[PDB]
Amino acid sequence: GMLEGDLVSKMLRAVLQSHKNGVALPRLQGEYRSLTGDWIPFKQLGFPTLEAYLRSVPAVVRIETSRSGEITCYAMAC
Amino acid sequence: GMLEGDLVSKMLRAVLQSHKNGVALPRLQGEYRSLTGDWIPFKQLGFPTLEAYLRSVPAVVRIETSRSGEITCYAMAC
Amino acid sequence: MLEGDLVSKMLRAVLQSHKNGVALPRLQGEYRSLTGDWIPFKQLGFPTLEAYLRSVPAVVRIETSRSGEITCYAMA
Amino acid sequence: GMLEGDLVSKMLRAVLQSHKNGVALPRLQGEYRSLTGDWIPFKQLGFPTLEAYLRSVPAVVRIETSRSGEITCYAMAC
Amino acid sequence: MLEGDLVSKMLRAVLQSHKNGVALPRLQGEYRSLTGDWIPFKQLGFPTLEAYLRSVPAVVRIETSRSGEITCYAMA
Amino acid sequence: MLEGDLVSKMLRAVLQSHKNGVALPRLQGEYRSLTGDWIPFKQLGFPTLEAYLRSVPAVVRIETSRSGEITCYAMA
Amino acid sequence: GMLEGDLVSKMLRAVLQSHKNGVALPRLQGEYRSLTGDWIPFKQLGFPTLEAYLRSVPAVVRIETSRSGEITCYAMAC
Amino acid sequence: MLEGDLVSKMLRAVLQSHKNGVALPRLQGEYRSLTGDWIPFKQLGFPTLEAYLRSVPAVVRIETSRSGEITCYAMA
Amino acid sequence: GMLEGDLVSKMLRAVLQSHKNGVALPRLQGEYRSLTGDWIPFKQLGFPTLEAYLRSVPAVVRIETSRSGEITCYAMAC
Amino acid sequence: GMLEGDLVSKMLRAVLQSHKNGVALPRLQGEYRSLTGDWIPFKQLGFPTLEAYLRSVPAVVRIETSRSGEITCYAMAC
Amino acid sequence: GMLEGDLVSKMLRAVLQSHKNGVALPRLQGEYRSLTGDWIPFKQLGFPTLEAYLRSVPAVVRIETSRSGEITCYAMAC
Amino acid sequence: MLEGDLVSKMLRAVLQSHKNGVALPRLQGEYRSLTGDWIPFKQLGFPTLEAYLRSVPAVVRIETSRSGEITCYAMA
Amino acid sequence: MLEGDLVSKMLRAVLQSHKNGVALPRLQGEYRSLTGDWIPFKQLGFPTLEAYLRSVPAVVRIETSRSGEITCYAMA
Amino acid sequence: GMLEGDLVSKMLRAVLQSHKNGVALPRLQGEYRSLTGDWIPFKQLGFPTLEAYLRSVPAVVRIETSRSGEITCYAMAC
Amino acid sequence: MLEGDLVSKMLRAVLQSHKNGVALPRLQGEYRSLTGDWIPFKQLGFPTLEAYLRSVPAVVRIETSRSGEITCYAMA
Amino acid sequence: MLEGDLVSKMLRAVLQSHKNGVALPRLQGEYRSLTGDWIPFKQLGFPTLEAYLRSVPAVVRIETSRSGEITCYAMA
Amino acid sequence: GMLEGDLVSKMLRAVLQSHKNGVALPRLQGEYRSLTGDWIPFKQLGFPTLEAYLRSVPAVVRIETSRSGEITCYAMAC
Amino acid sequence: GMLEGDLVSKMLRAVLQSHKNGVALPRLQGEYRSLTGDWIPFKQLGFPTLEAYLRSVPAVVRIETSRSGEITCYAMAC
Amino acid sequence: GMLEGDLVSKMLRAVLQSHKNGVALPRLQGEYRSLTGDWIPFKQLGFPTLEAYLRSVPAVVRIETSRSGEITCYAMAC
Amino acid sequence: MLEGDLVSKMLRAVLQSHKNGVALPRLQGEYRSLTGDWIPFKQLGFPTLEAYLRSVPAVVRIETSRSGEITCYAMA
Amino acid sequence: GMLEGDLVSKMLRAVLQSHKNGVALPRLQGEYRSLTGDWIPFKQLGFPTLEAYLRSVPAVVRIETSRSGEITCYAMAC
Amino acid sequence: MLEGDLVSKMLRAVLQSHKNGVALPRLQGEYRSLTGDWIPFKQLGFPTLEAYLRSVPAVVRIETSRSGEITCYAMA
Amino acid sequence: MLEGDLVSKMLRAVLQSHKNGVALPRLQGEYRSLTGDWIPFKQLGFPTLEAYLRSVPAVVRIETSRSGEITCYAMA
Amino acid sequence: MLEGDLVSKMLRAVLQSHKNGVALPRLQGEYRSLTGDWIPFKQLGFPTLEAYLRSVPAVVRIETSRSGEITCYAMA
Ligand SMILES: [Cl-]
Ligand SMILES: [Cl-]
Ligand SMILES: [Cl-]
Ligand SMILES: [Cl-]
Ligand SMILES: [Cl-]
Ligand SMILES: [Cl-]
Ligand SMILES: [Cl-]
Ligand SMILES: [Cl-]
Ligand SMILES: [Cl-]
Ligand SMILES: [Cl-]
Ligand SMILES: [Cl-]
Ligand SMILES: [Cl-]
Ligand SMILES: [Cl-]
Ligand SMILES: [Cl-]
Ligand SMILES: [Cl-]
Ligand SMILES: [Cl-]
Ligand SMILES: [Cl-]
Ligand SMILES: [Cl-]
Ligand SMILES: [Cl-]
Ligand SMILES: [Cl-]
Ligand SMILES: [Cl-]
Ligand SMILES: [Cl-]
Ligand SMILES: [Cl-]
Ligand SMILES: [Cl-]
Ligand SMILES: [Cl-]
Ligand SMILES: [Cl-]
Ligand SMILES: [Cl-]
Ligand SMILES: [Cl-]
Ligand SMILES: [Cl-]
Ligand SMILES: [Cl-]
Ligand SMILES: [Cl-]
Ligand SMILES: [Cl-]
Ligand SMILES: [Cl-]
Ligand SMILES: [Cl-]
Ligand SMILES: [Cl-]
Ligand SMILES: [Cl-]
Ligand SMILES: [Cl-]
Ligand SMILES: [Cl-]
Ligand SMILES: [Cl-]
Ligand SMILES: [Cl-]
Ligand SMILES: [Cl-]
Ligand SMILES: [Cl-]
Ligand SMILES: [Cl-]
Ligand SMILES: [Cl-]
Ligand SMILES: [Cl-]
Ligand SMILES: [Cl-]
Ligand SMILES: [Cl-]
Ligand SMILES: [Cl-]
Ligand SMILES: [Cl-]
Ligand SMILES: [Cl-]
Ligand SMILES: [Cl-]
Ligand SMILES: [Cl-]
Ligand SMILES: [Cl-]
Ligand SMILES: [Cl-]
Ligand SMILES: [Cl-]
Ligand SMILES: [Cl-]
Ligand SMILES: [Cl-]
Ligand SMILES: [Cl-]
Ligand SMILES: [Cl-]
Ligand SMILES: [Cl-]
Ligand SMILES: [Cl-]
Ligand SMILES: [Cl-]
Ligand SMILES: [Cl-]
Ligand SMILES: [Cl-]
Ligand SMILES: [Cl-]
Ligand SMILES: [Cl-]
Ligand SMILES: [Cl-]
Ligand SMILES: [Cl-]
Ligand SMILES: [Cl-]
Ligand SMILES: [Cl-]
Ligand SMILES: [Cl-]
Ligand SMILES: [Cl-]
Ligand SMILES: [Cl-]
Ligand SMILES: [Cl-]
Ligand SMILES: [Cl-]
Ligand SMILES: [Cl-]
Ligand SMILES: [Cl-]
Ligand SMILES: [Cl-]
Ligand SMILES: [Cl-]
Ligand SMILES: [Cl-]
Ligand SMILES: [Cl-]
Ligand SMILES: [Cl-]
Ligand SMILES: [Cl-]
Ligand SMILES: [Cl-]
Ligand SMILES: [Cl-]
Ligand SMILES: [Cl-]
Ligand SMILES: [Cl-]
Ligand SMILES: [Cl-]
Ligand SMILES: [Cl-]
Ligand SMILES: [Cl-]
Ligand SMILES: [Cl-]
Ligand SMILES: [Cl-]
Ligand SMILES: [Cl-]
Ligand SMILES: [Cl-]
Ligand SMILES: [Cl-]
Ligand SMILES: [Cl-]
Ligand SMILES: [Cl-]
Ligand SMILES: [Cl-]
Ligand SMILES: [Cl-]
Ligand SMILES: [Cl-]
Ligand SMILES: [Cl-]
Ligand SMILES: [Cl-]
Ligand SMILES: [Cl-]
Ligand SMILES: [Cl-]
Ligand SMILES: [Cl-]
Ligand SMILES: [Cl-]
Ligand SMILES: [Cl-]
Ligand SMILES: [Cl-]
Ligand SMILES: [Cl-]
Ligand SMILES: [Cl-]
Ligand SMILES: [Cl-]
Ligand SMILES: [Cl-]
Ligand SMILES: [Cl-]
Ligand SMILES: [Cl-]
């Protein structure tokens, strides 16, 4: 019944909530596949990059950059 | 042995045939994932949207629009 | 207490008013009759009312006929 | 006084309502010209194809695809 | 009973209240005064209030002055 | 004596063989049965057989059902 | 004998000259069709929008914007 | 008497109701409680409620915590 | 019943056959409008320019260039 | 505190209000720089041309075209 | 922990190593899905075609074309 | 009775004629020898004969050598 | 034994039948008369029959008149 | 002597270091103009958006998103 | 008194000088002979002289031969 | 001695001839009357005469009326 | 000393003048190479197709289309 | 008489047949120029890269990739 | 009164004339800002790069490249 | 008698007037002094005067100094 | 053996070294063809213009602009 | 014996030198201290040092703090 | 004394060390063994080591096997 | 202790070795002579050595001659 976008959001929240210190963006597709069996379908959902998809779901994921320019993704409270 | 496109066609036919009143397009990726474990790879298959892929397989899927502009997908007889 | 939570609860109240469901073109009017205002589907992030209703499948069941007419039902 | 889009919508409704079994999309420009004297200005109205314009007016036209992949257009009730 | 039909009727009621027409920037406020809410021009599919008003020429006459100020009148 | 003229005449002959029309998926086979070869719709400049048939409305009448099945008839 | 662009210019001048307080741009295609039987072929004439075509014929049409951002078109004297 | 002026005044009234500020996700509900309707941020030309609030810095002070939670305060 | 492209082809043939010395391309839209009441819908038919549409119908129209680079259009025999 | 767009709007209003007969568009960047010390950042604000930015702020600036096709910009009352 | 690209590389190597005479490119998505349960995410990984992705991993896959123009993919030694 | 079904059956008949398989460049000729015409791979929706043959793996086994030469076999 | 080799030989046979050449629009029909089928110019990789004929200059000489009519001749 | 990019980096660091709780991205151009007299020239520096420029200077600016999807910019230590 | 009006009048004067018309490549020279300068077809908004001449059909008749040579005549 | 310097001086001479200014559509003709030729605004790098005149503000003052008519004056 | 475009023009004129009945466009690159030793550099000269380059040199080459849609190129007198 | 594409094909076959162990793609333009006096005109022939042109002529050239990702080109038998 | 382009030209001439051995292009934006307080608005003026703008004003700036490929900009005499 | 032929001859006449060549910025003025008008480089199909001069190497020799100044000479 | 780019570089150096006062860019293709028999293949080498290719080989060619905006090319010492 | 294998081994040696990990900005210097050169992250195919380190998770553990500072540890 | 000259000389020295050539994957390690550092193929302007080696054909002969393995030899 | 800080210090040491400056093409070699390796301009984020040197104006003064040759000097 759920929209593809709603299902992916729910799975991503499930991935991020396991990890108290967040997930480095380069590791995120792998950590999501570990839970779900497949990749985050960011192109399908209408985004050019995984980062652009993540920006579009701010109530699921908090983005923070590091000095190197890498993103770490945290589960947004709620 | 089968082409990616042939496999997806077969899976989509299997999804749609379960549903006597068809599947609303917004629900289709979810209903296909429920059967198959993954999403319909419409970008891979060379289409910009899921609707454009579905138009390309008329002997698998019948498209009908509603007054709202939403598509419902039916298994095409055969 | 989120906007979406309040709208969802009010929608459920409207749909439950109607045992036979509500034709989608009449939904905005029936909902305003109860709530005093429209369903804020653009604010909630959707291009159409029907697109919003697809986002709440636990609340509303949607039936579409073969002539393309849409009926909305309270989901139990 | 009317917007171009409103006038075209009204003319298209007038075309489709004559035809109880709908109008095949390949025949639609001709059948509309027969009534109106000119073509449906889908590029002007901001669409890349006639099909994309028709999708944008679901309360005027119902689209149904056939096994061949051709569209038939029906007047949407009302 | 469509949203657009109800909005159209309420707009007509507001404009008829005013023999001298209503300056377009004041229309939303006058309309809320009567109806309790705003004119839902985005929901109805328009980028601006004025774009919505152009969609209902049987309801509202629009005059624009040479300094670019807009006045709206009930259409008979 | 053009390719399109010959194909058109042969198609008419096939369709006239069938008072009840010919289901579009069966047309290529019936036509080969009579002519020894397929309808050359790509050579004639069309992406599909049905697209070719639309180019010859004086020859073939096309009916499409509400389930999307297509039947072709000789045009008088 | 005349260029398409010259004919359209002449027809547009004829439309605008009827209207002493000008024609709102949203109403212009309809008012031109009322006189001429067809639409202003702005895409053919090489413009992306009707407004861009109108800008290209300043000795035919004067553009003035209103507070809302709508254009009114006036016949340019001569 | 502009829509934006009225919304701004009503927002100020809501925020002043709350000495401790209002968490941004709760703002729409609190505002409807007072006014009878939602904050019309799309009509006013903004993609989000927060984007609208940034347009009125003389009215609302916005604080964001290091966990990304947002609190809105009446501006003196 | 006819395809838009077939109707336009037929009208164009009718225009060109009147003119024993052909029609200069700059004059063609005007001469076609004189017969038909509207313009040749080359963008609708999927071409960027009128010349590109004309190239696509060689059994209707013969193109010949002049020293200036202008095209003259002749009815192709048949 | 203010958005870039709000600041530019305010500065532009300040420029235009000095000039009772408006400012010719070709002169506007210079007249704005005279007051403010820099140029109107129309590309930053998401517009391809200065004219497109000005169209987007109709409650600040009234556009009127002249017979030559040049724009004059007036402060919109208020 | 692994990058998406590293995981896909490893899975592709596992697919190709089973097949002593290589895998025809048209059959590769199907043969990879048979092992892994999903498709090779070449668009995600930043490539327009499956062939372009495969070219980018030469130490995993050897490409050889046939007279028809079809590619066969072999596991690159190591 | 579909075109693709008939072509598939005729292809199988040709391949079965040859215990040692058929070199792909010779397939069109051998097939015409039996059927009177070519394999209609463009009509069936494929850019090449080999692309068509990939669409029918239950009918034809394809072997490609390390020098890039292709041999086609009847599939049991 | 390639498709293109067989088509080339059959084309030569058709053209040699005609001392005065063959008008290009009549070529498909004359060729079918001899061979039982059409010249497979799309299969062979060409958008048009004339484009195919340009690929075989050792087989066919093409003359075009100043009115744009095309005549094809066997090449010695 | 300095590169444009180095100068802008230095000015941005100066802006952000004043603000202990960071600067909301919507407020950043204004706060930078308050110090420097002009805007951050992100298009000149080769970026489509201000956010894309900021991502490119991670040793100057730390980005953190909020639940709404707004960015707050902090001076990166050093 | 517009540039285009003056150029048009001068062109007419040049063409009337010549009962047998003027070959288009010679027109600029003949026109300069009478007027002291060239026909300003770029200023008037045209990419070519011939494109300008098409804009004034009441002034100049243009004939093009089958070898592509152009002759210009005064229009009565 | 540059082209632009000479054109600028000649323009100034034309404008000074006219105490009441010169309507922009009449400028080319008046200028030719004095100089024997047109103002070479394309050569000088401008799409229009008015665009050229904007490049020389020390030479020409431009007034535009509210009906969009343009008058050019010698600058002191 | 000559511009590339002038040299190519001169060579093309030399090719076409040999051939009293013109040169079919499909044969032109070969016939030009026979005289000159290389191909006509139409992309270098700023054209997308050979036909577009030829259209740009009307005083060198006369284009005439045939019923099939093929161009024949003739030396333009002079 | 021959098409440009046919001539280039023939020359390329002549180049490759000299070299029993094939020609590394980086060396191919030079080795072809050594025989023919000019370069392979892959852009003219409608391809974005030399590799894309070579893929389009599989009955002339066999492509094989190496571990580094370099192509070697072999004359395809016949 | 002056056009933006004329003002920038004048400022650039003023910058370059100070420097007898010219200004290295990488240093130019900084040296111009030192005089003027802002950057050269090359995107506004319709150029993709600063170098493309500079090429467009040859009577202001002389460009000379060095062995490294860096440009030095000199004031053009006058 | 073509425009380009006449311009070429007049240019040669101007350049021959000057044994020491003519600095390119002064060429338009010197040429007008002799001919009464400017060199019509845009009409002749060139973006600049210098681009036109490159099209006539048999007429004008162009020297450019290391400071980028250009001198034009009659070609013998 | 040499890369296409290396061969062209060597030929260009050979052209430029003959000419003590350099070669005007408009004359360069002709002067290179005079030595080599063909044109500089700048599109093949991946550049949109001849000037862009020349910029890419600064140790072969020195570019200097003139007041008109024309480039002169000099052999770079070495 | 691959470059990547050698770099990986040398990196492990550097990280093992440090029980408390190594701050990422100091890693290049510490690594050069041991090896005589820098970590060749561009050669190995990565835009940044950190991007390279992500490619070797069996060798280096990366911790990032909430202020965005990065610490690298030998992986057991 | 250029970087490329020094790298070229050092590469030659490494390759000459090996009568049987050096497998390309081992080249970086062998070269570092002699020189103390890697071959700087990115600095020298190449995307890969093999792309750099193609730029110096007078120094290194490259052989590629039919399984795609690469061997590098000193060029005499 | 950053890579860029160490490279900067080593560069300064090399340049100070040379009172007369160092020609840019010789810089990499002189720097390797002192440090054992190349200047890592790609790692540091620059397309060229000269682009890197522009990033450190407090360290190196760059002079370019009118023939385009570059000399680098220690900055005091
Ligand atoms: Cl979705
Ligand atoms: Cl992590
Ligand atoms: Cl995806
Ligand atoms: Cl991504
Ligand atoms: Cl990403
Ligand atoms: Cl969200
Ligand atoms: Cl990242
Ligand atoms: Cl597929
Ligand atoms: Cl459903
Ligand atoms: Cl996909
Ligand atoms: Cl989609
Ligand atoms: Cl879709
Ligand atoms: Cl299908
Ligand atoms: Cl839908
Ligand atoms: Cl809403
Ligand atoms: Cl809806
Ligand atoms: Cl409905
Ligand atoms: Cl509309
Ligand atoms: Cl129908
Ligand atoms: Cl249209
Ligand atoms: Cl369409
Ligand atoms: Cl369509
Ligand atoms: Cl609708
Ligand atoms: Cl259709
Ligand atoms: Cl709304
Ligand atoms: Cl409005
Ligand atoms: Cl108003
Ligand atoms: Cl076919
Ligand atoms: Cl079909
Ligand atoms: Cl059917
Ligand atoms: Cl036109
Ligand atoms: Cl109106
Ligand atoms: Cl149009
Ligand atoms: Cl529009
Ligand atoms: Cl518009
Ligand atoms: Cl409007
Ligand atoms: Cl809203
Ligand atoms: Cl929000
Ligand atoms: Cl929040
Ligand atoms: Cl059509
Ligand atoms: Cl005509
Ligand atoms: Cl059209
Ligand atoms: Cl056109
Ligand atoms: Cl056209
Ligand atoms: Cl034309
Ligand atoms: Cl803003
Ligand atoms: Cl002004
Ligand atoms: Cl900007
Ligand atoms: Cl602009
Ligand atoms: Cl603008
Ligand atoms: Cl303007
Ligand atoms: Cl990855
Ligand atoms: Cl296989
Ligand atoms: Cl993908
Ligand atoms: Cl693909
Ligand atoms: Cl692929
Ligand atoms: Cl393949
Ligand atoms: Cl076929
Ligand atoms: Cl094949
Ligand atoms: Cl084969
Ligand atoms: Cl075919
Ligand atoms: Cl044909
Ligand atoms: Cl013919
Ligand atoms: Cl920079
Ligand atoms: Cl803030
Ligand atoms: Cl910018
Ligand atoms: Cl932005
Ligand atoms: Cl941004
Ligand atoms: Cl933001
Ligand atoms: Cl002109
Ligand atoms: Cl002309
Ligand atoms: Cl002529
Ligand atoms: Cl001019
Ligand atoms: Cl003007
Ligand atoms: Cl005027
Ligand atoms: Cl050229
Ligand atoms: Cl020929
Ligand atoms: Cl080319
Ligand atoms: Cl082409
Ligand atoms: Cl072409
Ligand atoms: Cl020409
Ligand atoms: Cl052709
Ligand atoms: Cl070809
Ligand atoms: Cl080789
Ligand atoms: Cl090419
Ligand atoms: Cl390439
Ligand atoms: Cl390539
Ligand atoms: Cl390669
Ligand atoms: Cl400007
Ligand atoms: Cl400097
Ligand atoms: Cl800018
Ligand atoms: Cl730049
Ligand atoms: Cl630049
Ligand atoms: Cl300049
Ligand atoms: Cl530079
Ligand atoms: Cl000119
Ligand atoms: Cl010049
Ligand atoms: Cl000069
Ligand atoms: Cl190369
Ligand atoms: Cl020279
Ligand atoms: Cl090229
Ligand atoms: Cl170029
Ligand atoms: Cl160039
Ligand atoms: Cl170089
Ligand atoms: Cl140049
Ligand atoms: Cl590296
Ligand atoms: Cl890093
Ligand atoms: Cl760090
Ligand atoms: Cl390197
Ligand atoms: Cl490598
Ligand atoms: Cl290897
Ligand atoms: Cl480096
Ligand atoms: Cl360098
Ligand atoms: Cl140097």
Swiss-Prot record, chains A, B, D, G, I, J, K, N, Q, R, S, U:
Give the disulfide map.
none
- Tell me where it resides: Cytoplasm
Residues annotated as domain HTH OST-type = 4-77
Q: What does this protein do?
A: Component of specific cytoplasmic RNA granules involved in post-transcriptional regulation of specific genes: probably acts by binding to specific mRNAs and regulating their translation. Required for lens transparency during lens development, by regulating translation of genes such as CRYBB3 and HSPB1 in the developing lens. Also required during spermatogenesis.
Its subunit composition reads:
Found in a mRNP complex, at least composed of TDRD1, TDRD6, TDRD7 and DDX4. Found in a complex containing CABLES1, CDK16 and CDK17. Interacts with CABLES1, CDK17 and PIWIL1.
User: Which medical condition is this protein associated with?
Assistant: Cataract 36: An opacification of the crystalline lens of the eye becoming evident at birth. It frequently results in visual impairment or blindness. Opacities vary in morphology, are often confined to a portion of the lens, and may be static or progressive. In general, the more posteriorly located and dense an opacity, the greater the impact on visual function.
Give the similarity note.
Answer: Belongs to the TDRD7 family.
Could you identify this protein by its name?
Answer: Tudor domain-containing protein 7
The organism of origin for this protein: Homo sapiens (Human)
- The gene is TDRD7
Q: Which residues of the full protein are shown?
A: 1 to 77 of 1098
UniProtKB/Swiss-Prot annotation, chains C, E, F, H, L, M, O, P, T, V, W, X:
Q: Which disease is it linked to?
A: Cataract 36: An opacification of the crystalline lens of the eye becoming evident at birth. It frequently results in visual impairment or blindness. Opacities vary in morphology, are often confined to a portion of the lens, and may be static or progressive. In general, the more posteriorly located and dense an opacity, the greater the impact on visual function.
What this protein is called in its record is Tudor domain-containing protein 7
How does the record describe its quaternary structure? Found in a mRNP complex, at least composed of TDRD1, TDRD6, TDRD7 and DDX4. Found in a complex containing CABLES1, CDK16 and CDK17. Interacts with CABLES1, CDK17 and PIWIL1.
The family line of this record is: Belongs to the TDRD7 family.
Q: Where is the HTH OST-type domain?
A: 3-76
Which compartment or compartments is the protein found in? Answer: Cytoplasm
User: What is the purpose of this protein?
Assistant: Component of specific cytoplasmic RNA granules involved in post-transcriptional regulation of specific genes: probably acts by binding to specific mRNAs and regulating their translation. Required for lens transparency during lens development, by regulating translation of genes such as CRYBB3 and HSPB1 in the developing lens. Also required during spermatogenesis.
Q: What is the top-level taxon of the source organism?
A: Eukaryota
Which source organism?
Homo sapiens (Human)
